[PDB]
Amino acid sequence: HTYYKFDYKAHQRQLTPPEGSSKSEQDQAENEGEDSAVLMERLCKYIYAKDRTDRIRTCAILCHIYHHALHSRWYQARDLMLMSHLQDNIQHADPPVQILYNRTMVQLGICAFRQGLTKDAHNALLDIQSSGRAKELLGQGLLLRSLQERNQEQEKVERRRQVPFHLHINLELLECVYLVSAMLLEIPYMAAHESDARRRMISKQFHHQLRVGERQPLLGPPESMREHVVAASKAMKMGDWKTCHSFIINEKMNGKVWDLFPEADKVRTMLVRKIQEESLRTYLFTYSSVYDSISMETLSDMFELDLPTVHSIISKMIINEELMASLDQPTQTVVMHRXXXXXXXXXXXXXXXXXXXXXXXXX
Amino acid sequence: YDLTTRIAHFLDRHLVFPLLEFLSVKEIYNEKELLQGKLDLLSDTNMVDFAMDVYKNLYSDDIPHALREKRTTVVAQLKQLQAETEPIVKHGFRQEYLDTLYRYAKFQYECGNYSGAAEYLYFFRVLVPATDRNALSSLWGKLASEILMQNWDAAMEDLTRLKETIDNNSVSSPLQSLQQRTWLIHWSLKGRDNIIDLFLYQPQYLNAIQTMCPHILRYLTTAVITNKDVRKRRQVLKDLVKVIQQESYTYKDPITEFVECLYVNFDFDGAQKKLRECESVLVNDFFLVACLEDFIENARLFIFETFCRIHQCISINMLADKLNMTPEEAERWIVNLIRNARLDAKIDSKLGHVVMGNXXXXXXXXXXXXXXXXXXXXXXXXXX
Amino acid sequence: PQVYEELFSYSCPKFLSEPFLQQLKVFSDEVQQQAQLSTIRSFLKLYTTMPVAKLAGFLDLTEQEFRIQLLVFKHKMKNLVWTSGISALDGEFQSXXXXXXXXXXXXXXXXXXXXXXXX
Amino acid sequence: RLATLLGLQAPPTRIGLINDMVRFNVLQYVVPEVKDLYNWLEVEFNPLKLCERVTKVLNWVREQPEKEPELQQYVPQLQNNTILRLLQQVSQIYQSIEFSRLTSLVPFVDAFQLERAIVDAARHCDLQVRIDHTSRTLSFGXXXXXXXXXXXXXXXXXXXXXXXXXXXXXXXXXX
């Protein structure tokens, strides 16, 4: 009855609980500088024991992680999760644990994204957001629609264990978050592939949806949230970062996806920056064909990215992808479009490998 | 950084006091924190030599009661143990004798006489009931005492005796402990390329005993980053960036995490500014102090190489101005680096121009093509 | 060389196997000295103009320190590798036919294909 | 499918559609400025004078309550068409023109937006370019190679003309 709420609401429930109660009482706990945190960690420490059952123990643990992930720093929660050591246990069962296992995963996925760690968030959410049935996997579904299903009631009452709406977290927020991640991650790697350098292969969430839109007979101006994200993606492809930033709000505004966070301004500017970076990357990837040379000053001004970031991103990427590109730091200029001799050498190597393989079969 | 937390952070007694004394000796004689805490900590224990040093100037004022009590209780304990061991050598039981050897070891160690702590520690060799517990624990002890006496040779030795020993359990960290000791020995003994391989390898999730959790993060991180000669792209990428387990240690000291992210990401100026920032703290590290100047210089050289290979022609003056570090200093560093042959940088300071080079050219490509053709021919022959 | 020299030193016995007939190991030593030279030629120039310091670092590895002033010029005399601008005041070394080469490669490719088809 | 769905015998081209626009009834009720615009862009397009013509024609549309309303919502695509034509024509006029001059020659919302447009025209293959950001120049094509194959492409065109000319001469022979 506590964890899913804010420290305030919780302390209201607690205060109001104590006002009713008689002044004389017996309490195991000793008062601490933070009343609430000590309550949660207190009952937490209580529940877990070697003797204690996994369903109860694991329940406790999950509640800790949920509360902590909401009201406390993310790293603490991560540490708890990896130290707690529940892989088999979390899945089964605890009756209500399933929600905690997926609910707390969602929550740390959300807080890590609030911290503007994209690489982390996409790591976190992929398993659970691959689910078509995810709405049900989070234990949020209208009771009625499955109440006609589950009947007879004897079996049915046990089955309908889905969590309450107040506990439940909106799906649109989660999905938009993950898709925003998968966008930032998979777009430059896609673009480069469009470039055909093919140094590395990356997968971006919501990629399939984008493909469907391209093959669609009709292309409408964005209405559903995934369409706003979509437009932001294509905008990144063409190198308009301003358009992309605009679109996310437009998709978001109907969605109300970004409005559901208290820090929304901070994350707006943070995302604006990360998007500036990755869009700069994407631009460079797609347009290096027709451009033999570049200007870091102009690029810096136009992407609104200070040169220290620009030169860094470009040099890093070029070195990582083995791109035939050359940068003069002195004049701040870049060079491409080359190597032939080296390429041929590589091909020869590959061929040799194939031959060796064939020999194996022959043997 | 605050001392309370650092001293608090390390479980080991030697780290607890030896580190305080290092911080005190290492940086400023005047500062209170190294001496006050070391004084108070020593007064909690049986070593009057350390206590005598504290008594001496730059140390907490000498107390007659503290020394006499320690000294006398020691005389008594030594007589006791001497007798007990006499009797144990004379019930003919291996376990009791082993305990006596161990207990003489403990007594000598706390008393601060390390040579003897070692001798009587390893005297438990013969009377070991089993190699794995009797013998491996003897190893852990020789390892502690050897680290504290500063012979890392011996540390590696008892590391190979321990990890060479036939019975090994995957579940037990002691793997972790031994990794830490080996890493530490390598680090104390171009880049080793061993230290980092060790430190990066695993985290017990249990107290190091030998290595501070932060200590493993920082030692692993810096040693790796400086291993240009040894390190693979994977070694930067495979064994550090991509290594999820090591991430645990890394999140402990985030300044180092960002330092490594900066380097891997090509912003070497940021990386080197972090390093400049931490330098004063890292010179306080009892194990790291001696290698600091070397590792940072190596990292700088690696950064220069990354810059240096990617550009055929460099405007040196501009780089020095745009470096975020002084141009003259950068030039001096390059000059120092070059003779070692670390860099094939073609540099005149005065010109400010730098130029590095990695029918002739045309012939080169042609040669390569011919090479591949040869390989193909070989394959054909093999098939036949 | 340091490894090469040691290899001769350890497997001194193999070389000896009569003793008068091979009193001095003459042939093996001659062979080793040729062997040492090949790697330097392997860089084989291909650079129009080369920094002296890079050359010095590479020639330093060779046992004689002064060889590069001498060792580099000596290499030019051998003609295995070509040095341009050597002995210069600057002190920095400078470093249809193509069609024929290409045609040659094409021929090899065809030959390989023929063997494949015939096979 | 939708083109067949509108009783159109086949998907049309913009030139085709325009001819209906060309027809008098569309023309007769059509504001004059648009007929002029059509001349400026579709009939006699010359880059050395298009900017001026547009500058003198664009004032009239803004003043009109109705014309401006029709115009306001097509500014973007119109601008795109005009600039596309300018890039093509510049591709015909030049071999390597300065970035300052090329951007200067054709009006743009911003210098960088002009570069964007130029590349977009290149990706859609309305022009082939190589942009050298170092020297601030653009080339409508290693250097000698690009000159050799430009020469070949000129020689070919010349031959074609000669051939056609010969045909005409044959007719003159009869005269």
Numbering used by the authors:
A (entry chain C): 299 to 636, 1000 to 1024
B (entry chain E): 4 to 93, 121 to 219, 227 to 395, 1000 to 1025
C (entry chain L): 406 to 422, 438 to 515, 1000 to 1023
D (entry chain A): 354 to 494, 1000 to 1033
Tell me what the authors wrote about this structure, in their words.
Eukaryotic translation initiation requires the recruitment of the large, multiprotein eIF3 complex to the 40S ribosomal subunit. EIF3 is a large and structurally complex molecular assembly that, in the majority of eukaryotes, consists of 11–13 subunits (eIF3a-eIF3m) with a molecular weight of 600–800 kDa. We present X-ray structures of all major components of the minimal, six-subunit Saccharomyces cerevisiae eIF3 core. Yeast eIF3 engages 40S in a clamp-like manner, fully encircling 40S to position key initiation factors on opposite ends of the mRNA channel, providing a platform for the recruitment, assembly, and regulation of the translation initiation machinery.
Many viral internal ribosome entry site (IRES)-containing RNA elements require the presence of eIF3. The recent structure of the 40S-bound CSFV IRES in complex with eIF3 revealed the structural basis of this interaction, with the IRES RNA occupying the eIF3 binding site at the 40S platform and creating a secondary binding site for the PCI⋅MPN core (Hashem et al., 2013b). Because IRES interactions are also mediated by eIF3a/eIF3c, we were able to model the interaction by fitting the eIF3a/eIF3c heterodimer into the 43S⋅IRES EM density map without any adjustments. This fit of the eIF3a/eIF3c heterodimer places two loop elements (between helices 2 and 3 of eIF3a and helices 1 and 2 of eIF3c) important for IRES and 43S binding (Sun et al., 2013) in close contact to two extrahelical bulges conserved within domain IIIB of the CSFV and HCV IRESs. Consistent with our model, these RNA elements are protected from RNase digestion when bound by eIF3 (Sizova et al., 1998; Sun et al., 2013). Based on the convincing fit of the eIF3a/eIF3c structure into the EM density, we attempted to dock the recently solved paralogs of eIF3e (CSN1) (Lee et al., 2013) and the eIF3h-eIF3f heterodimer (Rpn8/Rpn11) (Pathare et al., 2014; Worden et al., 2014) into the eIF3⋅IRES EM density along with older models for eIF3k, eIF3m, and eIF3l. Using the previously identified positions of the various eIF3 subunits as a guide (Querol-Audi et al., 2013), we fitted the models to agree with features of the EM density. The proposed arrangement defines the molecular interactions within the core subunits, with the HCV⋅IRES, and with the 40S subunit. Remarkably, even the helical bundle structure recently proposed for the 26S proteasome lid (Estrin et al., 2013) fits the remaining density after placement of the PCI and MPN domains, suggesting that it is a conserved feature of the PCI⋅MPN core of these functionally diverse complexes.
